[PDB]
Paper text:
Soluble epoxide hydrolases (EHs) are a class of enzymes that can promote the asymmetric hydrolysis of epoxides to their respective 1,2-diols and have emerged as versatile biocatalysts for the production of chiral intermediates. The whole-genome sequence of [name], an endophytic actinobacterium isolated from Citrus sinensis branches, was explored by genome mining, and a putative α/β-epoxide hydrolase named B1EPH2 and encoded by 344 amino acids was selected for functional and structural studies. Each protomer of B1EPH2 adopts a classical α/β-hydrolase fold, which consists of a cap domain, which is the more flexible and less conserved region, constituted of six α-helices, and a catalytic domain. A group of 12 aromatic and aliphatic racemic epoxides were assayed to determine the activity of B1EPH2; remarkably, this enzyme was able to hydrolyse all the epoxides to the respective 1,2-diols, indicating a wide-range substrate scope acceptance.
The B1EPH2 crystals belong to space group P4122 and diffract to a maximum resolution of 2.2 Å. The structure of B1EPH2 was solved by molecular replacement using the structure of the [name] B from M. tuberculosis, which shares an identity of about 49%. The r.m.s.d. for superposition of the three different protomers in the asymmetric unit is about 0.3 Å, indicating that they are very similar and there are no large conformation changes between them. This is, at least to our knowledge, the first description of a hexameric [name], in contrast to several dimeric soluble EHs and a monomeric soluble EH characterized by our research group. The hexamer is stabilized predominantly by hydrophobic inter­actions, with similar interaction surfaces of 724 and 708 Å2 between protomers A and B and protomers B and C, respectively, and with a further nine and 14 ionic interactions observed between protomers A and B and protomers B and C, respectively. Similarly to other soluble EHs, the active site of B1EPH2 is located in a large groove of about 35 Å between the cap and hydrolase domains, and residues from both domains participate in catalysis. The conserved catalytic triad is placed in the hydrolase domain and is constituted by Asp114, His312 and Asp281. There is, however, electron density in the active site of B1EPH2 which has been modeled as cacodylate. The cacodylate makes interactions with key residues of the active site, including Asp114 from the catalytic domain and Tyr116 and Tyr251 from the cap domain. In contrast, similar to that of human hEPH, the B1EPH2 active site has a volume of approximately 630 Å3 according to the POCASA webserver.
Numbering used by the authors:
A (entry chain A), F (entry chain A): 14 to 336, 346 to 353
B (entry chain B), E (entry chain B): 14 to 335
C (entry chain C), D (entry chain C): 16 to 335
C-alpha cells in the first residue's frame, strides 16, 4: 500500500514485479496459488517495523511479472533463478526467503539450490518434501479412484482455464472461501479437491459470503489481477511437477540444513495431507527452528492469521539476527 | 472513473470488460493497439453529458477482457461477436459503434456484418477499406525494401513479444511518443514502421519527455495493463490479417451503408498512408457524413484532440437523432 | 438449355450448371451429392420463369477443393455463394439448399440478407447458432455407440471406409435414407457406429432406390471416384469452427421469406422437431413448412414433382 | 471397343480403359496427364493384336488418391501395376510408360521382371538408382533460380499456382512442351522459377497445339478440376523416398526386352544424354532408342502414328 | 572369433558390420530379435569347414551396424538393400541368405525381391508367409483379449524401451531363458507374449539359471551390445510391420521359387503359431527341400541345436552344389 | 583393464556404466567428446596406487550408459544428477569430481550445484566459465563470418551425425590426430574448427598416422564404442548449451569456492580460446589450488601427458587429504 513501494526488476527470465517495505536484511516473500504479492500486505509493514526489508514478488506467471508462453518456462529452476536475480537486483547478496503454498516449494528449492544466497527459509502451509523417486503425475493419478485429483485435473492445458474463465471472480471467491479455516466440514473440504468425470472443480465450491480475511475490495484486487493475467501462468506451475522431479534429481532426498521455519494451518489440507513429509523434518530440515500449527486456521495462513504469522516470522528472524516438536497456537 | 462504472459481461468467447457512463442510446467505443478502454477516458463524460450511454470495452486480448490462447481466436469474426454480445448484454438491441486504430476495422466489420445491430459507425485514424483481392501479408512483405514492415514483424509469435517485454513501459512510452503529432519529422515518422534486419522496432522510438496527452500516471495505467496482460492478445490482432481477408470474402468490395463518420490525424500514417481508401469513400462509405482530418494531430486522436473529437462525435450522433 | 460454367471466387472456383432466364435461384446440394442432385429442378425452374444455378459445393465435383480442413467452414461456403451470384451478373438471389446445403443456404440468408432475399431449406431445419459446442453434443448422444457425425470428425477415418468401394458405399447410403427403405429400428441404428465397426455395415443391400438409376449412380460415383470424399466430409469437420464463427449471429432469426420442405421419413426432420417448432420465432418470414408423407432424405429426388410445385409456387408467390 | 474398368488394388483402386484382345500392354501416362493421353494408341494396339490397358495413375482421374504424400512412392505405383495385371486375368504383361510413367514402368520391369517381361519407355530415359540424393541434385541446379522439381516439393505451393486457373495452366504447360513451341532460350527458362515468380509466368499463350483440341483440353481440365493436382504432384514429392526404397536395385540394369522413344525437342531427352548413352549397360535388352525429329514432350500425341508403328512393330518382334 | 574376421562395409543406408569366416560361396547369415551376429558363432566355423564363406551381419539397428534415427528407416526394403550391398561389397554377385527370427522375413524378402542375387534362402524359426491382405496391426490388436500382444506392445516408441532399459541384462536373460525349449510349460510360454494392462512384458519372464546354450560370458556379449546400442533400432523392426505390408504389396501372395530350407523348434511359438504358413509351403515355397521341426527345441535354434542346424545347413547347401 | 572393475549403477536417468579402481576417497572422472571412460585408463591405476578409489563413468549418451531419446535429456542438470547418484550408488557421501573437455563443465557444475557432495573439483582442458548473460547459440553464431563455428554446425539434429557416420573410425582418427599437440600448425589447427558452407568438418582433418597416445588397438576401442552408440548422445551435449544457460541462470556469475585444480594443454584450443575465463579464476575459482599448463600438450591431456596428469592430480588430492599463477610444465 503506502510506505511500501512497487519495483520492476530484470531477471534472466524477464521482468519481476514486487512490492518492498522496510530497511534491514532482505526477507523475500513468495505467494502461492492463485494469489499475488498482495497476499503479504499484512506482513510488509510488520516486517518493516521489526527492522527488515520485506519484498513480496509476483511469481512468474502472476500479476505484473513476466509470463513466458512455454509451459516449461515455469519449471522450479526458473522460479529459483527469479528469486536469485531479485536478491541481486535489490543490491543484496543474501536473503531470507519465505514462501506460502506453491511459494513454499519455490522457497525451499531456492534455499536448497542456492544456500549461499538464501541463508534461512520460511515455509507456510506446504511442508518441505525432498525430490522423490516416483513421477508426480503417476502419483496424482492413483489418487481418487473414480474422481480426478485436482492436480491431475490441472495438467491438461486450457482445461482448468476454461472452467475458471467461466467466471474468474466467482471461481476465486469460491476457492478462497472454500479453503478458509472452518468454512467446510472436513468431509466436503476433502471432496472439494476431487473432480467427478464431466464435472467442474468449482461445482463443490461454497457460494456464501466472503470469509472475514477477504473484503470485497480485496477480492477486487485479486480478481483484477487474474482477469488481466489469465490463469495459465499460475496453472503452469502445476504442469511442471514432472519436469521438476527430473531437474531436482540431483537433490534426490536432500535436506535443507540452513535455519528453517514452518507455519501451517490446522484446518489446511496442504498441511494434513502431507503430514508424513512434515514428520520427516528431523531428517529433511535438520535446521528447523520450529514447526508451528495455527489452530482453526485454514489455507490462507498469512491472511487468516496475520498477527500470528507476523509474530512468528519476526521472532524467528530476530532470533537469527541476534543468534523437535509441533507447536500449536490458539485463537 | 468518477461517474463511469466498470462491468463484466458474458459473450460467446468469454468475458468482456468495459467501462460505461451515461444514459441513452448506446455508443460502443473500441480502442486500438496498444491501448485500453482507458483511451476513451475523455470521451466517456462527454458522450454521457450529451445524452448517450458510452461503453468502452477492453478488446479481446486486452486488459480485463478474455484472452484466448489460440491465435485465430482474435480473428475479425470474434471481435464482431464480442461487440454484438456486448450490445445484447447491456440490454440494447442497437448501438452506434465507434472504433479507433484497430478498433476501426473492428467497428467497420461490426457495421458490415450486423447492420441490424450497429446502425451507425464512426471510424478514427484507420479509414474503411472494403475486403480486397490481395492477401494482406503479400503486400506488407513487399514494401520497405530491405527493411521489414512492422506488421510483417508482428506476424511471428513471440518475436515482437520478446522485443517489447525487454521493457514494456519503455516500449509503450516510445511508441506513444513516436506517433504523437509533431514528435518526429515525417521522414523519421515513416521509417519508425520499418525494421532493418537484426534490428528492433523500438530502435527508432524517440526517448525523452512524454507527450502532453499522456501523463506519467496515464503511462502507469497503460503499462500496468500490459505488464499483466502481456502483448500476445494485442499482437494476435495483426496475426489474423490473412484469416480476416479469407473470412470477410463474402463481403468483398461491399460498402457500409449505415451513417458513418471518419476522423483522422494529418500526421498519422494510419490516415495518410491510405489516401486511396479515403478517395473511395463516396463509393465505399456512401452514408458518410464527412471525413475530418485534424491538422497537426498524430495517431492518438481521441487523446491528442479530445475536445474536437468529442464535438465531432456528439454533433454527428445528434445529427442522426434528427 | 442447361449450361456448365466455372466461376471465379475468393476461395478459388465454383462449378455450376444453370438453366433458364429470370430471377436467380441458387441451388445448394447436400452430402454426399452433386449439382446433379437438382437435375429434376433445373428444367422445372426454367419453365416457371427462373434462372436456376446448381453449384458443386466447395469440395465437390468440379469446384475448388482446398487442402486445409477449415477452408470448408461455413463462411467459406457463404463467400462462394455470394461470389457466384455476382459472377452471374446478379445482385440478389433466392438460395435453396438441401441437407448440408440447408445450413449453407440459411447462413447465406443470415449473413448477406441484402444478397439472398429469400431462402429455401430442404430436409434440414434451420436452428440458430446456440451456445453449446456441437461436438460435445454429438459425443454424449448414443453412449456407447458413436454418432456418425463424431465418426466423421477424424481425418482419414470415414475416407478409409468409403474408399473400400466408393460406389457400393454411395449406393448403400442413398438406399438406406430413401423413404421406406428401413424399419425405424434399422433406420435409427444406421446413424451409429459400434466401436470397431464401419458405418456402412448397417447399410442395406439390394436394388437401387426408385429415384436412382444405374446411370444416376454412375454420375455420382464417377464424381467421387475423382474428387474423393475429404472435401465433402470436411463440411462435418467444421461444426465447431462454424459454431464459433457464427457467434455474432447467436440466436438470430432469418427474417426474409423462407420455405421449408422435409420428409416425414427423414431423420433430419424428426430429430430436429424443436427447430421446426421454433420456426415462428426463428423463421418469422416462413411461408410454410411442408412435411411430405412417406418421403425419405433425398427429397428433391424422391418427390421431384412435389418439390418443383412447392418451389415454383413459393417463388411465384414472392414476386406477386 | 474400349471399356472402362475399376480394379481392386492393395492401395485402393486403379481405373483404366482397355481395348483389344491378346497379350496385355499396360500403358502408364505422365504428368499432368490421364489414361486419355493414350487414346490414339488404344485402337492401334487393338488392331495389331494386343489388349491395351491405359490406367489412371494413382492420384489421377478415377484411381485412388490417398492423402499421405508417401503413398505415391514408386513401390506403390509398382504394386498398382502388378495388381492390375492380375486383376485383368493375366500373369505377365508388357508395360509402356511415358514421362513419369517411364520410371514407373522401368521400376515395374526392374522389381517384377517375372510379371513385366518387356518394357517400353517414352520421353524419360531409364537411369538406374544412383547414390546421390535427388533433391540435393535438383537444388544446386540453376543457382539462383529454382528448378521446377524443387518448386514442386513444397505441399500447396504448386497447387496454389495451378488452382488459379487449372485449365489455363494445363494449356500453357501442354503448349510450352510441344515440339517447336519455344526457342531454346524460352524452353530452358520454362523449367526454372525465379524467386517469388510462378512457373506458369513463362508458359506461352495463344493457340492450343496441334495435338490438343479444345475438346481434348476439356477432358484433361475436367479431370483435374475434380481430382486436383496434389496426387499428380506427390509423384515428384517422392524422389528422395524412391531413391531410398530402390537402393536394393542400386545400379541394377533392366535385362528383359526394352524400347525407348524420345523427342529431339524434349528436354527430358537432352538433359539425360548420359542415361541414354549408358543404355548398352543399363538397358542391355534394348531393341532400339528412337529420337523423333522435331518432336516435343507429348510424344504419343505429337507423333501418334510413328509411336504406334514403333510400339506394334516392337511388340510383334518380341513374340516372333 | 579365432578364424573369423570382423568387417565394416558401406551400403546405401550406411555402415554394416559383419563377421565372416571361410572361403567359397557366400552364405549370408541374418540374426533376429534381440540378438547379434554373435548368435551365429557356432555356424561360422561349421560353414567355413564345409567350404563356404559365412558372413554374419549385425542387422541395421544392432551392434556395430548403422542405426538411423527414423523409425521407417527399418522398413523391409532397407534391410534388403543392406543385404544386397553387403553381397556386392564382399565382391560377390550371388549368395545364399539364411535368416533366423526377424532375419527370416528379411531373408525371405531378400530372396523375393532380388532373386538374381539371393539364389537360395534358409529360414529359421519364422516360416515364410507371403504378403497378405490384412493390415498386420489389425490382427496383433485382435488376439489376447484384454491382454495386449507383445508386438502391439512394441509399437509405441519408448514404451518397450523404458521397460527394457530398467535392466537390459536382466531383460535379455529373462527373454533368452523364457524362450529356451522346456524352460516354461506351454501355457506359461504362451502368455509370456501377452501383457496385461499396466503390466510389463518381463513380468512373466523366468528368473534363475541361464539356459545351457548361453554362458554368463555369452550374456556379457549380448548385454554389452545392447547397453551400447539401445533397443530402438531392434524394436523399430516391429514398428514397420504395416509399412512393410504396404511396401511388399507388389509381391502380394508371391511365392519364393529359389531353393529354400526351413528349420524351426517344436517348442518355439514363432514356429507353432504359424502352422498355417507351414501348411502352405507346397504353394508358397515350391522350391522347399524340407521343413525341419526340432523336437524339444525352443526359439534360439542355432544356439540350442547348433550341431543339427549346422548339419542341416551344410548338407542343404552341398545339395544345391550338385 | 585389470584390477579395475566394471559396474552398472542405477540413477534417476537410468543406467550409468563405469570402471572403478582402488580403495580410499572417491575420485569421479568425467570424460569429454568424443571419448569414453577408457580415456582415463592411465589415471585409474595411478589414483588407485596413490590411495584413491577412481571411478571413470561413461557420460550419459556414451558407451554402456543410458542414452535417452529426448535431446533435453542431456541438459547439464541431468549430468549433475548422474554424478550425484553415482556417488551415492558407490556407497559414498562425498567425492572429488574431475572432468575433461565436456566433462569439465559437467564437473564444475556438479561442484557448483551440489557442493556438499562434490567437495573438490578438477578441470582439464576446458576452464570454468560461469553462466553468462548471452544466449550461447547467438554467440557461437557471431563466430566465423563466412564459416560456421563447429558448435553451430553441431546444433542441427542428424547433421553432424550424417557427416560422422560416413566413416566413424576415420572421423575419430582425424579428430584425435588433429587436436594432438603439435599435429597441426596453429593456423590449420584453428581452421579445423570452422566449416565452410557445404563442406564437412572432417575435410580439414589430417590423414596421417595415429598420434603416439592412440594405438590402433586404442582406436578399435573408441571406434568400437561409437559404432555401437552412434554420435547423437555425444552431440546432444552441444545441443543443450542454450537450455543449460537457462537452467543455470540461478547460478549466474557464481564462483566455485571448494578447492579446485585446472590442468590444460598449451597447444589446446579449448585452453587458448577461453583464456579470459581462465584469467578470471581469482574471482570465479577462489579456491583454485593452481592452474597447470602442459607445454607441447594438445587436447587429449590425460592421454598425451598421462604421467604428468597423474602426478598433478595425486599431488593435489594428497594435499587436500592431509590438508595466483599459471604453472607451466615442460616435456
Ligand atoms: C497446495 As495448492 C491449493 O497450491 O494446489
Ligand atoms: C494501425 As497501428 C500503427 O496501430 O499497428
Ligand atoms: C443429415 As446428413 C446426410 O447431412 O449427415
Ligand atoms: C519431365 As516432367 C513433365 O515429368 O517434369
Ligand atoms: C518373432 As519374436 C518372439 O523374436 O518378436
Ligand atoms: C571443447 As570440444 C572439442 O568438446 O567441443
Ligand atoms: Cl501465458
Ligand atoms: Cl537475519
Ligand atoms: Cl495469450
Ligand atoms: Cl524490466
Ligand atoms: Cl482434399
Ligand atoms: Cl489428395
Ligand atoms: Cl536409434
Ligand atoms: Cl541398471
Ligand atoms: Cl540417441
Ligand atoms: Cl580427499
Amino acid at each position: 500500500e503506502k510506505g511500501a513501494v512497487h519495483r520492476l526488476v530484470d531477471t534472466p527470465g524477464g521482468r519481476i514485479h514486487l512490492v518492498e517495505q522496510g530497511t534491514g536484511p532482505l526477507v523475500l516473500l513468495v505467494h502461492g496459488f492463485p494469489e499475488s504479492w498482495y497476499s503479504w500486505r499484512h506482513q510488509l509493514p510488520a516486517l518493516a517495523a521489526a527492522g527488515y526489508r520485506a519484498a513480496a514478488i509476483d511469481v512468474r506467471g502472476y500479476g505484473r511479472s513476466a509470463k513466458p508462453a512455454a509451459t516449461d518456462a515455469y519449471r522450479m529452476l526458473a522460479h529459483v533463478a527469479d528469486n536469485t536475480a531479485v536478491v541481486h537486483a535489490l543490491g543484496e547478496e543474501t536473503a531470507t526467503v519465505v514462501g506460502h503454498d506453491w511459494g513454499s516449494p519455490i522457497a525451499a528449492n531456492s534455499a536448497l539450490l542456492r544456500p549461499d544466497v538464501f541463508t534461512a527459509v520460511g515455509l507456510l502451509s506446504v511442508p518441505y518434501a525432498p525430490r522423490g523417486e516416483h513421477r508426480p503425475t503417476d502419483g496424482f493419478a492413483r489418487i481418487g479412484g473414480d474422481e480426478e485429483f485436482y492436480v491431475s485435473y490441472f495438467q491438461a492445458p486450457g482445461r482448468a482455464e476454461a472452467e475458471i474463465e467461466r467466471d474468474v471472480r466467482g471461481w476465486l471467491a469460491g476457492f478462497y472461501t472454500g479453503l478458509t479455516g472452518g468454512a467446510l466440514t472436513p468431509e466436503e473440504h476433502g471432496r472439494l479437491f476431487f473432480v467427478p468425470p464431466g464435472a467442474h472443480l468449482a461445482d463443490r465450491f461454497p457460494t456464501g459470503p466472503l470469509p472475514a480475511w477477504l473484503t470485497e475490495a480485496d477480492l477486487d484486487v485479486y480478481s483484477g489481477e487474474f482477469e488481466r493475467s489469465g490463469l495459465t501462468g499460475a496453472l503452469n506451475r502445476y504442469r511442471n511437477v514432472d519436469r521438476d522431479w527430473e531437474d531436482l534429481a540431483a537433490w534426490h532426498g536432500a535436506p535443507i540444513t540452513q535455519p528453517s521455519l514452518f507455519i501451517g494451518g490446522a484446518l489446511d489440507a496442504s498441511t494434513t495431507w502431507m503430514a508424513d513429509a512434515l514428520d520427516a523434518y528431523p531428517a529433511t530440515l535438520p535446521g528447523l527452528s520450529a514447526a508451528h500449527i495455527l489452530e482453526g486456521c485454514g489455507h490462507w495462513i498469512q491472511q487468516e492469521r496475520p498477527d500470528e504469522v507476523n509474530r512468528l516470522l519476526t521472532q524467528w528472524l530476530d532470533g537469527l539476527r541476534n543468534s523437535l516438536e509441533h507447536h500449536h497456537h490458539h485463537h
